[PDB]
Design a protein around this ligand. Structure first.
Ligand SMILES: *[C@H](CCNC(=O)CCNC(=O)[C@H](O)C(C)(C)COP(=O)(O)OP(=O)(O)OC[C@H]1O[C@@H](n2cnc3c(N)ncnc32)[C@H](O)[C@@H]1OP(=O)(O)O)CS(C)(=O)=O
Ligand SMILES: *[C@H](CCNC(=O)CCNC(=O)[C@H](O)C(C)(C)COP(=O)(O)OP(=O)(O)OC[C@H]1O[C@@H](n2cnc3c(N)ncnc32)[C@H](O)[C@@H]1OP(=O)(O)O)CS(C)(=O)=O
Ligand SMILES: Cc1cc2nc3c(=O)[nH]c(=O)nc-3n(C[C@H](O)[C@H](O)[C@H](O)COP(=O)(O)OP(=O)(O)OC[C@H]3O[C@@H](n4cnc5c(N)ncnc54)[C@H](O)[C@@H]3O)c2cc1C
Ligand SMILES: Cc1cc2nc3c(=O)[nH]c(=O)nc-3n(C[C@H](O)[C@H](O)[C@H](O)COP(=O)(O)OP(=O)(O)OC[C@H]3O[C@@H](n4cnc5c(N)ncnc54)[C@H](O)[C@@H]3O)c2cc1C
Ligand SMILES: [Cl-]
Ligand SMILES: [Cl-]
Ligand SMILES: [Cl-]
Ligand SMILES: [Cl-]
Ligand SMILES: [Cl-]
Ligand SMILES: [Cl-]
Ligand SMILES: [Cl-]
Ligand SMILES: [Cl-]
Ligand SMILES: [Mg+2]
Ligand SMILES: [Mg+2]
Ligand SMILES: [Mg+2]
Ligand SMILES: [Mg+2]
Lengths: 437, 437
């Protein structure tokens, strides 16, 4: 079949690559509205912090390399502006010529993702971070203006990683957030170490704070405070790139996302949707789920590839919502339903705080593990872990447990790999099980 | 019930404590043949290494504290010398006075564990390591004799830990082993980094080598080599402490262990056996298993506590044999059937070698993960992982998978916690699933 793909990054380029792996004869074309395909979204803050300095890490492919290795045609600076589903074409705008045209397809795959929100100030010193063009612009503004002092707005993983990286680059960031609900994928009371790490390094922050006015480098805040900053990075949420889809017969939800089935089909024949734009359901509970992260994009890419050119018995089973972020010395990880989704269940909570490993083994740090479960069937609903060591391991194990519909009580049976540098004879995970009794 | 426990460490002290949690009325007495209860067997190599300098870390309780806090009576230097199972008493030797006596019981719990084998040489410079008394003796011997050259015999995980610690203490160890099967819970080819770390540090080793004769500090070897050593630490395997049991009606296997059911009952009513002395079966395949490690001792202790004083529908479901050791910069972990046990199955092997985390993120290292599956049902039989980073995490996740008899193909669905310091959007575990076709 002729295959058209919208977006050439996490979902799009992966899906197209996976299809080629299976089908060597279908013609495949990808339209990407911006300059680069296959950029490393998740590497971006580390590029800014000069942790990553080889561009070969920031960008996996050029369209030329992509064609030469995989025979996939990628048109950058081409923005799809409409989907004409009844005639099986998309309308595409060549941004270089400002000429538009129709491209036909047998199968269409939508992976446009999402864009960064902006606060909307008229400001030459304010930037968002979503792609490599953004990253290049920030790096350039920093150098050309000898930036020292940077204001970071927002407190999600993107803003937190940018802050840490700006600090390590040798700059002087300040963090503000409109409320005190930082890092909201994590249980609110488990985020204290973020503030501790800031304090330890004498990095200023103000919560319940906003930009009120901007005049050159003079920044006036809601609190009444006035300071001067050389630069601002806004990380104040995202929104779905689905405007171009609204005129079509494709069903969108009221927030602009695309509900899909377990084959990542939309309501329209021959049209699939994957990545941040797509919504689905949880694997372990009968609720809708939207998990705009890397894992879901890659997994859907593979499933769509099988559907089109491989084994169409292969279907999605739902999300668990596993997620993680590093902030300075600490790791923050969670899986399962979001904090706000718990109220839909009659649940209880159990928790343990314990050294990640043997106390007498040097380098210990306490690890807080919390697990929520359903009282009506003992099923695990959510888990969260925070500590300098061992949090990722604990959450991945609980992710596998939930995949298998394990009960909280069954966690006593988890046979951990134990030696002093790694865990305990009754691991934190085991202790969750004993304490639920 | 009146409860008598034999052995006061991993199984015995733990089981007694777990019983008290549930039962505040019953009289509980533990007999321990040596000086110390509740020593940290696992910490002992690190004591020798002076990594653990403070004894509070090597000893968790005294009989006196155990009584004040738990109202359990612990009699040290008291060796149980016979089980009078028909009258329900045990014979006990007070080693201080050399007088014996009978102690009655309603329930008897046997956790006597295992003793170190010895090569049988007459030598004042040779030591084994099994308890805190052994540790104090080794430490004292090194100080008293200004030991520099040390011969470490055996390449089990304990001996490797001892070697590493002697090295970090400033001593100069040499490793020998009677065969080339070092660290034998791990795939043989995956043990190479042990030998790499030794080579890197100019720590001598000789495999397929044995002691021929000892003449003072002069050691004659099977190879014909003769060298001078100030000290010898032999780690040449263990034997079960079951001599005191043979006269009773308790069924022993031919190696001296006690087969038990999933309630950890012996063939004799009211007698339980746990810890290194007991044998059981695997959880994921129908084979007999013996897994003489900490997790099993602690798990059995809880189950026996529930049987006696709690919910007696709680039963063991078998072992997976999860195990791990650290040796210098590398981690070595495996789970499932032993290498020698694979031949009872029609099996295939899948493997990946990939960065533990994102390539661009610093301090990355190659992680080798290998998975064996049964061709008749796609079920995972065994997994192994070796590397400086991430091996413990992958093996724990796979232990949780096997607990659920998950197939190799379903690893494709494992929802990992992804950010650049931790893994990949398609983790090594997912990759095993994709490569299984
Ligand atoms: C933060 C956000 C995540 N963002 C991204 O991932 C965006 C950038 N990514 C992309 O554009 C694509 O995902 C690329 C093109 C980089 C990767 O495509 P694929 O995942 O299809 O893998 P690839 O074709 O590059 O193959 C390399 C490696 O994978 C093996 N392989 C892939 N699939 C399979 C299957 N299904 N079965 C067996 N093996 C498979 C393949 O063999 C391969 O080894 P080799 O290529 O042989 O040497 C995260 S971020 C971006 O890191 O910042
Ligand atoms: C290597 C080799 C393994 N060796 C050993 O284990 C050495 C010998 N061990 C022992 O003697 C026992 O395990 C001791 C006595 C050390 C521990 O007794 P147990 O009951 O585990 O533990 P304890 O009573 O001390 O409780 C402490 C902690 O856990 C909670 N807890 C225990 N059981 C339960 C249950 N069933 N349910 C809920 N909670 C339980 C307990 O309340 C207490 O918590 P807090 O800290 O106040 O929360 C290894 S090594 C390390 O070198 O020895
Ligand atoms: C800074 C940053 C850090 C992140 N870190 C993590 C992390 O640590 N862990 C994690 O799991 N996730 C992380 N993510 C999220 C992860 O990158 C996304 O979940 C993933 O990229 C989603 O893939 P996607 O294809 O749906 O969207 P994208 O990868 O963003 O790709 C969408 C592409 O479609 C293009 N497009 C949109 N509309 C059109 C159109 N009309 N025509 C043509 N092209 C169009 C866009 O230009 C864009 O290039 C991070 C994201 C960012 C921005
Ligand atoms: C140096 C070392 C390091 C280790 N490291 C690890 C590790 O990293 N990870 C891991 O999982 N496992 C490790 N282990 C193994 C772990 O310690 C054992 O699996 C665990 O202790 C088994 O507990 P047990 O109660 O059966 O025996 P033990 O803990 O050894 O206790 C048995 C006790 O019973 C006493 N006893 C025996 N006979 C009698 C009798 N007749 N009368 C009275 N008392 C008696 C003994 O003196 C002994 O104190 C290590 C062991 C050692 C020795
Ligand atoms: Cl091209
Ligand atoms: Cl054209
Ligand atoms: Cl056309
Ligand atoms: Cl808010
Ligand atoms: Cl369900
Ligand atoms: Cl006494
Ligand atoms: Cl005396
Ligand atoms: Cl680490
Ligand atoms: Mg640079
Ligand atoms: Mg139209
Ligand atoms: Mg000391
Ligand atoms: Mg199944």
């Amino acid at each position: 079949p002729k295959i058209v793909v919208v977006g050439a990054v996490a979902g799009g380029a992966t899906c197209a690559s996976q299809i080629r792996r299976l089908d060597k004869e279908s013609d495949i074309i990808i339209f990407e509205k911006d300059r680069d395909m296959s950029f490393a979204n998740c590497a971006l803050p580390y590029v800014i912090g000069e942790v990553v300095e080889d561009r070969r890490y920031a960008l996996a492919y050029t369209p030329e390399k992509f064609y030469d290795r995989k025979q996939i045609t990628v048109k950058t600076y081409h923005e799809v502006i409409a989907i004409n589903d009844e005639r099986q074409t998309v309308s595409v705008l060549n941004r270089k010529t400002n000429e538009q045209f129709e491209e036909s397809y047998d199968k269409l795959i939508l992976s446009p993702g999402a864009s960064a929100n902006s606060l909307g100030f008229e400001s030459d010193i304010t930037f968002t971070l979503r792609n490599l063009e953004d990253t290049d612009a920030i790096d350039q503004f920093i150098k050309a203006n000898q930036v020292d002092k940077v204001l970071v707005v927002g407190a999600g993983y993107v803003s937190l990683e940018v802050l840490e990286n700006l600090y390590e680059r040798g700059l002087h960031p300040t963090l503000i957030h409109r409320s005190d609900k930082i890092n909201k994928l994590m249980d609110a009371d488990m985020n204290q170490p973020i503030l501790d790490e800031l304090d330890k390094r004498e990095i200023p922050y103000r919560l319940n704070e906003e930009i009120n006015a901007i005049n050159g480098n003079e920044i006036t805040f809601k609190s009444g405070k006035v300071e001067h900053y050389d630069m601002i990075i806004e990380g104040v949420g995202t929104h779905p790139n689905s405007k171009f889809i609204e005129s079509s017969n494709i069903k969108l939800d009221r927030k602009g996302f695309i509900p899909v089935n377990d084959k990542f089909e939309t309501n329209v024949p021959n049209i699939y949707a994957i990545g941040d734009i797509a919504t689905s359901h949880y694997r372990h509970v009968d609720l809708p789920a939207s998990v705009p992260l890397a894992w879901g994009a890659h997994r859907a890419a593979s499933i769509v590839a099988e559907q089109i050119a491989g084994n169409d018995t292969i279907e999605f089973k739902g999300f668990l919502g596993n997620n993680i972020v590093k902030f300075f010395d600490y790791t923050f990880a969670s899986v399962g339903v979001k904090p706000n989704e718990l109220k839909q269940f009659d649940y209880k909570m159990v928790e343990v705080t314990q050294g990640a490993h043997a106390n007498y083994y040097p380098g210990n740090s306490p690890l807080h593990l919390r697990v929520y479960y359903d009282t009506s069937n003992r099923q695990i609903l959510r888990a969260a872990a925070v500590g300098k060591e061992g949090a990722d391991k604990r959450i991945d194990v609980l992710s596998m447990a939930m995949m298998n519909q394990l009960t909280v009580d069954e966690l006593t049976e988890f046979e951990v790999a134990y030696a002093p540098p790694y865990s305990h004879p009754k691991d934190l995970i085991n202790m969750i099980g004993y304490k639920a009794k």
